Every structure is written in structure tokens, then in C-alpha cells.
Amino acid sequence: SQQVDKIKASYPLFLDQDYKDMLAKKRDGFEEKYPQDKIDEVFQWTTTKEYQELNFQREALTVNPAKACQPLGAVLCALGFEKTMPYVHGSQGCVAYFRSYFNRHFREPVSCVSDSMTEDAAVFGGQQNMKDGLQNCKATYKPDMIAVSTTCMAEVIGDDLNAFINNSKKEGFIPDEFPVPFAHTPSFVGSHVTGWDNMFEGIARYFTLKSMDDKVVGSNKKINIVPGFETYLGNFRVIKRMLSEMGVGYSLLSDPEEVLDTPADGQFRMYAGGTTQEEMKDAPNALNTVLLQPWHLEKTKKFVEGTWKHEVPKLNIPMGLDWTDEFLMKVSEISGQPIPASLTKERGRLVDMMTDSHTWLHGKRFALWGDPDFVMGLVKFLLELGCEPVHILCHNGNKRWKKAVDAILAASPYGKNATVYIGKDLWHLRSLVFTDKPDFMIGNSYGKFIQRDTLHKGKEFEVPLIRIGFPIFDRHHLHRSTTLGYEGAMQILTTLVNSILERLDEETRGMQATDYNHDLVR
Amino acid sequence: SQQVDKIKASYPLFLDQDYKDMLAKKRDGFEEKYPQDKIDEVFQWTTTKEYQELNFQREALTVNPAKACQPLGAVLCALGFEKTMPYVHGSQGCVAYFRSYFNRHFREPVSCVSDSMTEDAAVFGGQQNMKDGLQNCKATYKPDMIAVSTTCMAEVIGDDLNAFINNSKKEGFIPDEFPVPFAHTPSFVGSHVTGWDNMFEGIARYFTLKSMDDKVVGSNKKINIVPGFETYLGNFRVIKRMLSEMGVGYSLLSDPEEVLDTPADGQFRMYAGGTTQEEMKDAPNALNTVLLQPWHLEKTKKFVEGTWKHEVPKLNIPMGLDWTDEFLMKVSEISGQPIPASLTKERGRLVDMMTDSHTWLHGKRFALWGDPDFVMGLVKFLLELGCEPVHILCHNGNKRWKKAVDAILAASPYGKNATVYIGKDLWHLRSLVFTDKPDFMIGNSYGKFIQRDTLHKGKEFEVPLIRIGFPIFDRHHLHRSTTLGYEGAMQILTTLVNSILERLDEETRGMQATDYNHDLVR
Amino acid sequence: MSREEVESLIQEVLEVYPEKARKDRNKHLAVNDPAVTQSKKCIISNKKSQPGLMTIRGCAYAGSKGVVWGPIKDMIHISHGPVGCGQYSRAGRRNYYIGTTGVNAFVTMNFTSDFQEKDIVFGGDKKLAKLIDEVETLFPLNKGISVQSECPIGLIGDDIESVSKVKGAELSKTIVPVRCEGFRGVSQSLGHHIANDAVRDWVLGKRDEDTTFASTPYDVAIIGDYNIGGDAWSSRILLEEMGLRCVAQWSGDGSISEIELTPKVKLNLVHCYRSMNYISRHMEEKYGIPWMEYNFFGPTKTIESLRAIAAKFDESIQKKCEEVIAKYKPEWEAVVAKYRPRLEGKRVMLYIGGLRPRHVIGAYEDLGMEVVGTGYEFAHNDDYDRTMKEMGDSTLLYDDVTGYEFEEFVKRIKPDLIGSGIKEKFIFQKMGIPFREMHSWDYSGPYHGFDGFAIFARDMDMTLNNPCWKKLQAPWEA
């Protein structure tokens, strides 16, 4: 039954006695489920170290991974460019999933097209699919550019993107001067960040490889900024703000900030501001190119060094105090601009918040996961805060990245209990947080289930989740936050210290039991 | 006992068995405590309607007020001026308390002095204290201006600030040209915001009243901005940013943003950027003066309209969508500068966030409290969001403000279940949230105890607290948040939606019990 | 409003397409004409989507793993292939269930083989067998395993049927291979068909020789209800209040046991005809179980369906049905009395998948609103024949609408509300038009039954009458 004055959604409508009785009758009558004693025993078994050893002996089964396929990152990189349509050569279900994922993370329209390849395309190869798709896309949506990525289905059958695009141009399906950069993005190699790398390398090679003769390094007195796979608009904004404050002329290649943050004013804009083709063409004339996330921009680094002849600095991601300082120092060295007093004041204020919150931050234990550069920067910042990153997980990491993170942890006394895991999924991390309980775990929304599991063991075993990373689905407008620079460091520090304080407040809210520590001042 | 590897602070140290037994023995042997059944009965009685009527029949007892005394606001106003020392003429305990309060809220050094009037000064007056204190303060801390407030002790005995300062100058204790503005701030009148009003009126009258002959309205092509009692640095920052983006010449009088956000770089700056004496002297030449918080700037408005001949606009606090629109439109009308495209885009992005989060925000019930202008703007924004501000409380409000808020509520369909309370403290609000339970309550840190009380009645009766207002003591670096403008509206929206989602996630974390609604996507 | 106006709008929006695209898209846009039940009314469906047009359809894997097989609780569904498809589909659908996740329930979890380059080059059958071994090791209480193929599996020629048979014989476990490669078919509908065929071939006949289960003259099985936000539970409480015994529930809060118990049921109540009609027809042919469609959207459709269902049994069931309708009348009467004035006379456009574009019209018209446009992504001509009676005269019908087509239709019709999925939600919210998610119920729900109708009315009023829609235009602009 329902009351019109107080309408109940699924929670807590299905907690009513009639619904409870109906569900109990269904369970005891037809579900044939195991007795609650067996379920409880097996759950307790899953929280032990024997189950942890069995879990970590896995070699063929992946349970709750933390990564995606390459064309997702390829689509994001394509969106980073001005009036550019992402075009995935392959099956339409992949594009539907990409759009749904990005829509749920960003709560913004995401534009992407497919050529809808089918059984016949799997037999004959999707050449007519590409011709008709390019014609239809340019006619219907009128993009200045079409950036072509691949679906694993087109990668298995070995479709030739270059020949297909060339034949589409020869047969008048698209004009010859129309920019159609392409990239092979196999879903069985790497992850989404690899797809971002491949798509950016393809676009840069399209716009620069044949025009390399008349380019002089440092002619336009600019610095090329390549951000990589970034899902925080605040990171683009903070990089641009810091570089404009320094008086440095910059070119942010693949800037999707405007298209992913269009205003609501009764009008829908398919295309917003992005990296124009003029900037892409004039990029080899820059003084140097800085890769914000160098651990998934290897192919881009190779291309930029070999072809543009840019001496790409060995820079870490500008996350936290030390690495933001190193980034700013390198930018000042490259561009010749001194660091202004505004950035110095911002750094001083970040240090002020660090000293203010060090008492509550010190000694805390964190299990974190995410992308390689983001995870490394978070580990560095936690080490700067006196925190212990006990469990470090990166599904899409490699051996060299693990070596770099191990060297970072060794240089600090707070990484003594740390352990980096690569190639591990979130079920492994569930086992880890059950057997070596941390204070908090930092990651995307997929960690919430882990938290639930811990709370089921007991209130004293619950490991709360702090949502920093991609994708965040159960919270709103967290994609507008910042993780780079002193601004991002301030936001991260505030989030961590306030999560600790909420946990302490909740644990001490019991009157005449634990409320003696329910302090007003903390 | 303490494990050296895992050291336990008071929580959870005092949950040990030996401590529990010792505490139980002490309580049973020497406390003469009422039986737990009697305590439970009394508490259940306190959470009832009969107790609510008895509590609301109060006329002489105040329990847990939400307001401070005038000299606190006077000190905050004085801190916003360049190289200015707040000087409270009276007893030192008041200044110690003011400094502790502001230190705990801002986590920043707060400089204020007292002349340490004692029993002897209480009997014979504190003119010698004034002379000695002014001379000592100028010699030691070297300010460019000393702003004098009063303690209730000096206000009762009728100490003449003007005569005392004039005698100090005429006897050579301070230079005759040194600026010593003064204000009478009785603690038994109004509240801290009234003290802010009094201090600003005193400073303006000190710098402008005598030199009114050579002043022409609009000469400097500027708009004066009077921010009132503000404890969010982001509010000053956003007002300056919006005015600068619009290309409007502005003079923000009493700017404490720099002195309350000093960088930590190994050097202690007692004074940072503030409103200069030249700005205060040139203020009458401005086109007009805009009062950000018109409900506690009555004396300032009267002085500005009567002396400077400025036609102060009838604008509300620029909080939310509509009122920020009116503020920007009025600034454009006064200054002749068109509203730029950046502010239009920011408003569109705020509208987009509202549209994205309306489903979760709609229908929520909020109790809330704070200062008059802040409460008014929060109610307006909540009505814009589709929420229901059921309990509106303002200890330092008046009948005119209550009428204005009632008119605001009656203009919206979401104000039907809203009641405004003036002259009521947080015990009244505790009764209200027990009887007419809202979804959340928005206020300062003092509401945490109320939340604890609700949790004692049961987990289903708990009313969570959202910390927006002053003072915030149990969280770190929340004073850097923004409340005014589109940026503040986005911040408040994100806080409210994510609080709702956090509560929903907590309520559905029970596996096999309520986890069917533990949705990954929300 | 006018049929000629709608035809002119169709011809105007079709202008930008090339000749082939325009010719193909012409057959998929129509103006509704009741009493017409055929593919004659310029509506062709279940065809290949035009490349490069930014469609909305999914894949066969989405139709099989994410729709039919996923909501089964005590079963582990392995996305055979690269990471990707399995990750984007994890916990995307709100098919509610009761269970201890990770122990005896696995709907939220994501099991995959995580294909690498070596698995593409050398195949992935041995990897699949090892994966099944590890699944058995780490998840003892699972009651079955289903493998869902992705595109490379069908491309590289991997024999998953042999591995499934061998491992099922070895472990005495039900291992169901599903060849739901994404490139198969044109949309999710072929995924529905393949999943239904797998259910028939590997699960349904498991207890044909068994006779332990005790039958009852009032045995019904809900099929096609995936418990989106609790819809299946809300319908099941109504069915059981009538005196019936809901033995099986496909597939939202469903287990393999009740799927095996379905052949013992007297009557099969089909909610989603589009996805479960194949299994309904097979069960009617083999076990002789009659199946009937029902609609629990809105009190009018709910009452009609309850009376029709009770008509198939004796008089006691019909008397209990009348008792239930009388009991629930005051609640939905109060809901409609409260919410109809706020929603009366509002125009709605919908674009959903298999049958929701037609099943929800009764609830909308019961609140005082008119559906001025509807369409499907993957429905067949049977669904269009069924919906032509439901749609009002001279109303727009669209099949597999592209982004440009739906954008232009919304621009010209100017509806007060749009009910669709997540990929167009923010597009239409930017336009300033109220939008409601008709796939996930905007994370609200349920929408079935009388309680569902109350929630649906509240949600429609909340979204349609929100003040934010009135603030899309800056005051200093005209």
C-alpha cells in the first residue's frame, strides 16, 4: 500500500511487512537457496587469508576489473579537438556503451558515430561501411574533422583504415582535403589510456608528418601541453590558469573542457571549443612539448621526439607539492618566464593547509586504485601528507611503472608498508582490504561494493571509500573537481581530512557510549 | 594498557574492558546517578510535543544560542583594512575569546588587542587604559590604523571613546594625524553582525564626514562594495572575480581575504592586503555603493545615503540564480558595462547542474539556521532548487526580516510548509527537528549535537547536518568555500546533492537487507 | 497536429541525408493510423542501421548478457572476450535482486576472460576451461555458469560449446554457452533471441523427467519482467494477493531453479513480449502452457490485466481479483486526484526499446497526458502492429531514430516532456525540455502496479513542474 502524502520509492517501499512476507515466501518456496548458515560460512571464508591466496593464484579469470578498452580513450581524445566527430569503425554496440559510460560520468551529451558493421561486414570487410559512414556523418553532422578509431571486431578481421579512407576519398565519398586522421585501437591490447595515446599520435601524424619541411622549433614561442586521458575539467582549467598566470604562451592539444561543460540555455551545441587544426599544424613550431601524463603517452612521446624533434622533459604528473613545483620550474626554464608571486602564494597556502591538517592526516592507511599517472601522483601526495598507502593497485600498469612507484615509495619512510600490484582487479583488492584492513580506500565508484562487503563483516571492519578517479557514477558533479596543481592538491587534502573527520564523528556519535569524544573542535 | 605498535587515543582507548569496569564502578559507587530507565524516560519526554510547547514557552532562559556579541563582528570588520589593528576597549577575556573563536574557524592567526580594563578601570574609567594601550599598540605592532571597539563592561559604565582618543592624541600618546576610528559596540544590543555594521559605519564616518566638501558622486567611475560580516574567503574572491571579469571599476571596502589566507612560507605576516585609507577616503567619489548583506548593514546604509549622497540599490544578497542575476544587472545598469559572455556561460553551467540534480533535490525538507542575509539567500536558493525549507531559524533576526522571508516563501509553491523563527535558539530547533522531522539541517558545527540527539532516538529519526555557515569547527578548510554568486550556488548544490546521495548510500548498504537499492549509478 | 504537417516535417528532416540514407530512413518514419495492423503504413523495422548516423541501438551481447542472462542471481555470467563490453555493462541495469553479492548472488559483479593479444592469436578455449576451474574454486555457492560471447570469440573461431559441455560434465554444473557476438544481428533483439534459445537448449528441460515439484491449479510464471527498480516485485505482490502462486519470475529477481520450474506452471504471464515471446511459444508448443500478455502500467491497465488474468481461472480467483481492485482503488484514486491537475493536458514524446513505448501510454493518459510521438530502437513489426491501436490518430512513429531526426522532431513538435534513455537525456536537458529516463526510471521506481503508479505520478510531476526549466534564459537576453 501507498500513502499519497508520503510516497515511497523502492527504498523503503520494499521494506514493508507485506513485501517482506512475499519475498520470504518466494525465497523459501522456489529459489532453492542455500541456508543462511552456509551463506554466512562462505562469506566468512571469503574474508580470510586462505581465500586471499586462492584469489591471488588466479591466472585466467578476471573479477571486477578496473580498466576499459582502447576506443573509449580514442573517443575522448577525438572529442578533445574542434568540431571533430569521433568515428569508431566497427560494431555499434561498442559506441553505445562508450556514450553511456561517458554520459554517466560527465552528465553531458557525448557525440560518437559508428559504421554499424554486421555479419556481412565480418565476412567481406567493412569498406563500404566506411565509405557510407563517412559520407553520412559528414552530411548529417557537418564536422570540420572526423577522427577514426577501431573496434576489436574490425581489428580481428584486419581492416585497413588507411586504404579504406583513401578509397573513400578517391571515390568522391568525402573530399580529398577533408581531414580524416585514423588510429588502430585494438581492445585486446592495453586499456583506454592506450587508446588515447594511439588516437593522439594518429591525429598529430596526420597533421604534421607531410608538412615537416618548413617547421622550425621554437618559432611561435609556445609550449605544447598534451594532457592525456583526463576526466576532470578542473585539471584542464588549472593547467590553463597556471600557464596564463605565468605569462606563458601555450597550446593545449586535445582540450575537451568546453564540449564536456556546455551551458544549458535552451540550445544544444554538438561542438564547443577545442584544439583547432591551426594549432595542430603549428604545433611542431613550439619551443617544446610537455606530456602531463607520460606513463600512457609513450607512442606520442616517441612521435614528438622523432618527428617534431622536441626535447620532451622527464616530468612527472603535476600532482601534489613537489611535482607541481617541478612542473612549474620546467615550464619556466623552457619558456623563460619567471614564476609569478600568485603561484608562490598558492603554494604557500597549500603548505598552510598541510600543516593545519597534518595532525589528522598522519599515519592513516589507504588502499588506492586508478590509472598509472593518477595513482602515482596520489601516492606521492599521500607520502607528502604523512599517510601510508598500504595497497596500491593499477590494473593497466606495467613493470617499469611498478619500478618507478617502488622507487618513489622507497625514498620515503611512509611507504614501508606499501605494496604495488599490477594486473590485479578489484576482487584482489577486496581480499587485500579484508586481510590487511586500511583506514580508507580511494578509487572510483566500483569500490562502493567493496565497502558494503566490509560493513557486512562488521561495523569495526568497514573501509570507507573516497571517490577520486574515473568513473564516478553515484555522486554528482565530482568531474568538475581538480587533481592537478596546488588547487587540486588543496581539494584532495580537504577531501581526505574531512572524510577522516566524518568517520571519527560517526564513530563517536553514540550517547553515553562513545560520545565523550564527540568534540565540537577538531 | 597500550600496544606500542597500535597506540589508541581516548577513542577507542576508553572502550577497553578495564576502563569500562572502572567507569561502571565509579558511577555505581559515587555518582548517585539516576537509573537508566528514568534517564530514558526523560529523554523520550524531551523528544515530544508537550516538551516542545514547554520549550517554546520560554521567555528568560536561552539554551544553545546561535549568535555572538558585537565586538566579534567589529573585530572582523576591522581586520579587513590595510595594516589595521583591532583594539577592543575593555576586559582582556573578551579578546581572548574572540581570538580563539576566529582561530578555530579560520585556522589562521587573528590579531586583536585589549587595554585590559580591570576592577580599578571599572570603577575609575578606562581613559588611562586607553592612552597606555594606544601608545603600546602603536609602538609594538606598528599599524597604519587602530580601530577601536568596546566591551560590554565599558559600554555599561559609559566610557567615551571619542573623548578618550582625543585626550590620547592631545597628550602626545599618539600622533595627532594617526587614524584611530572608533565604534560603540554594546554586547547587549543586536549581535556580531550589528558590531560589523557599527565598526564599518565608524570607519567610514571617520574618513569621510569632515571632507565632504570636495567630493563629487561618480568622479572615480567606481562602485563601492560593502560585504558585511563574511566568513567565507571564496565570497570575497568570487565578488572580485565577477566584477573584474565584467570590466567594472570597484572598491571593495573592508577586504579581509588576504590577512585570513596568509601563505605559510616560514615568515609570519601580521598584516596582509586590505582596504587602503586612500580607498576609504575616495569612497564618496564612487558612482554608487552596493551592500552585499543589506539586513545587517542598516546603519551603514543610512550613513552612506545621508552623507555620500549615494542611491544605494535595493538588492538582496547575490545568492542563488535569481539574486545573482539581479546583482549583475544592477551593476551593469550602474556602471554601463555589459555583462560578459563568461558570466553568461557560468550561469548556464549552474542551470545545467540544477537540471542534472533536480530529481534528487526535489521535495527534500531542510531545517536551517544562520545570519539573516545568509539564511534569506539560502532559503531563496532552496526554493529555486525545489526543496522545502521547513524550519527557518534566525536568532538575530527581526520582524522586518521575518516579513521579507515570509513574502519570499509565499511567492513560491515550495514555501507552503515553511515557518520562520526569530529569537529562538538551537534547543528550540532540536525540539522542532524531533517533532517535524526534516531530511537535513543546514547550519554551523553546533548542530552536530542536535544530530547526536536524534541518533539517540533511533537510526530512523536521525537528522544529518550539512555544515554551511559560521562557525565551522569540526571540519578543516571549509572557510575557503564560496557561497555568493554562480560559483557559490554550484558549490552549495554539489554539497546538498552529495549529502543526499551519501545518506542514501548509507541507508542501503545492508547486504541481503537493503542492498537491492545500493545502485552504482545515481 | 495535422497529418500533412507531420509528413512535411518528415520530408524536411530527411533532406540532409544522401540518396541512399534518405531512401532507407524514409521507410522508418510514419504517421499513426489506427485500425491498420501491417507493415504497410510506411513503417519498416528490424533492419540494418545506416552507418555514421549516431544511432541508439545496442548489440546482441547487450541483449543477451545485459538483459536476459544478467539478472539471474545464483549464476555467474562470464563476458568471454576483451575487457570492455563486460565493464560498460556492469551494474548498468537496475534489475533488483535479493542475495549476498559475491557469495550466492552475482548480478552486480563482472566476470570476464580479459582477452589479450595472445588469446586472439591462439584462441581462448583453454583459457575458458581454466577460468571455469577458477570460478568453481573461488565461488562455491554458484548454481550455474553462462558464457556470453563477444565479437572476437565469433570472429576467431573459438568452440565454446565443446568446452561448456566438457566442463559441465566434469563439474556436474550447468554451463550455458551463448553466441551473442555483437556483430550478430542489427540490435539487441537478436541477443534476446539467442539468449532465449540458450535458455531452451540448456536450462528449461533440466527437470522434464522430474516430478517432485507439487503443482497447484493457480500456478503462474511471470516472464519478461526484469525487476527494474523493483517492478517484478510490485507486480508479484498484486498477483499473489489475487490468490495465485508465482512459481517463476523471468529474470529480474530470478534464479535458475525457477527457470527450471517454469515448465510445471499452469499459465505464463508475459510482460515483455519482444524479449520472451520465443520461449513463451516454445513452452506452449512443448509443455502446452498457455501464455498471455499483461500490462501493469497505470491503474486502468493494471485493473484490466488483473481481470483478464483472473478470467483464466475459477470464480474464486476472480472474486479475489475484485477484492484486490477494491482495496487498491482509494490509493490510486488519491494519487490521481492529487497529481492530475498538475499534469493534465501535457504532451509527451517517447523513444524506448522493445515495448515500453507502447506499454506506458495507459499510465500517461490515466494522469491526463497525451503521447504525441513514439518509436522503437529494435522492435519488430509485431510491436508496431500492437502499438498502432494504442497510439492516437495522426501521431508520429519513428524506428531507430538517429540523433538529428529526434533532435529536429523535438524542435518542431515542442513537447512538454520526453521519456527516453541516457544518451539523449542531457541533449534534451540542454534544449530546456523536461526529460525522464524510461529505461532506469531515473533511478527511481518501481513503476508497475498501484505503488508504481504513485511513484510514476510523483516523478512526472517532479520533472515536468520543476522551476529550473523556467530559468533557462538569462534575464539580460531577449
Ligand code: ICS
Ligand atoms: S528487456 Fe528490452 S531498451 Fe524488454 S532490451 Fe532494453 S528492461 Fe527497454 S523497452 Mo532499456 S525490450 Fe526491457 C528493455 Fe524493453 S534494457 Fe530495458 S528499458 S522491457
Ligand code: CLF
Ligand atoms: S558490439 Fe557488443 S559491446 Fe561492442 S565489442 Fe562487440 S560484443 Fe562488445 Fe567490447 S572490448 Fe571494447 S566495447 Fe567493443 S571495442 Fe570490443
Ligand code: CLF
Ligand atoms: S572579560 Fe570574561 S569573557 Fe569578557 S564580557 Fe567579561 S566575563 Fe565575558 Fe562577554 S558579551 Fe561579549 S564576550 Fe565580552 S563583550 Fe561582554
Ligand SMILES: [Fe+3]
Ligand atoms: Fe550536465
Ligand SMILES: [Fe+3]
Ligand atoms: Fe591556516
